[PDB]
Design a protein around this ligand. Structure first.
Ligand SMILES: Nc1nc2c(ncn2[C@@H]2O[C@H](COP(=O)(O)OP(=O)(O)NP(=O)(O)O)[C@@H](O)[C@H]2O)c(=O)[nH]1
Ligand SMILES: [Mg+2]
Length: 165
């Protein structure tokens, strides 16, 4: 069986927790229940008729992750950097995450840049075009999700797994 580790990154408002909660438990909250500690969640997939065990890590801040990373996260096979399509400050802050991540981990890890909250399209404040160009130029693939409406999520994780394989 394959065993993979994936870590979730991005600013508060973005929906890291909502992404992995929806995926692993099919649950969602409108309340922002802020993530005080590293948490992990699991998912058994099947790809090429082979069982894939997936541990998904959800993080409690840039500073904590930054101090913990070199000790506790150097064996990560993928990383999902999330931003909120309705929040410009959050997408621009992804650059910070990409660099810091790569300044700590190999390039062997598969990066995803995730524009979450596509149920709020009417409030879009981030150009698809700009985000896609950014993803492409750091070797990340780009993805759109809604955790609230459960769209993009199963595909995001499956593709990340195919990639990590
Ligand atoms: N409309 C909408 N809201 C979403 C979506 N995903 C998350 N949210 C909302 O965004 C807020 C924060 O979500 P949350 O998962 O807690 O964010 P987080 O990235 O874990 N924050 P923290 O870093 O503080 O733990 C909540 O009000 C949550 O319901 C989405 O797809 N659509
Ligand atoms: Mg959280």
């Amino acid at each position: 069986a394959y065993s993979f580790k994936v870590v979730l990154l991005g600013e508060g408002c973005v929906g890291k927790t909502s992404l992995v909660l929806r995926y692993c438990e099919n649950k969602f909250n409108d309340k922002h229940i802020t993530t005080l500690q590293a948490s992990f969640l699991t998912k058994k997939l099947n790809i090429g008729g082979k069982r894939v065990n997936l541990a998904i890590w959800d993080t409690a801040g840039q500073e904590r992750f930054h101090a913990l990373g070199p000790i506790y996260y150097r064996d990560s096979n993928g990383a999902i950097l999330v931003y909120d399509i309705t929040d410009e400050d959050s997408f621009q802050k992804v650059k910070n995450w990409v660099k810091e991540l790569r300044k700590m981990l190999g390039n062997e890890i598969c990066l995803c840049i995730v524009g979450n909250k596509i149920d709020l399209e009417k409030e879009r404040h981030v150009s698809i075009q700009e985000a896609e160009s950014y993803a492409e130029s750091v070797g990340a693939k780009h993805y759109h999700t809604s955790a609230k409406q459960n769209k993009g999520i199963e595909e995001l994780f499956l593709d990340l797994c195919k990639r990590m394989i």
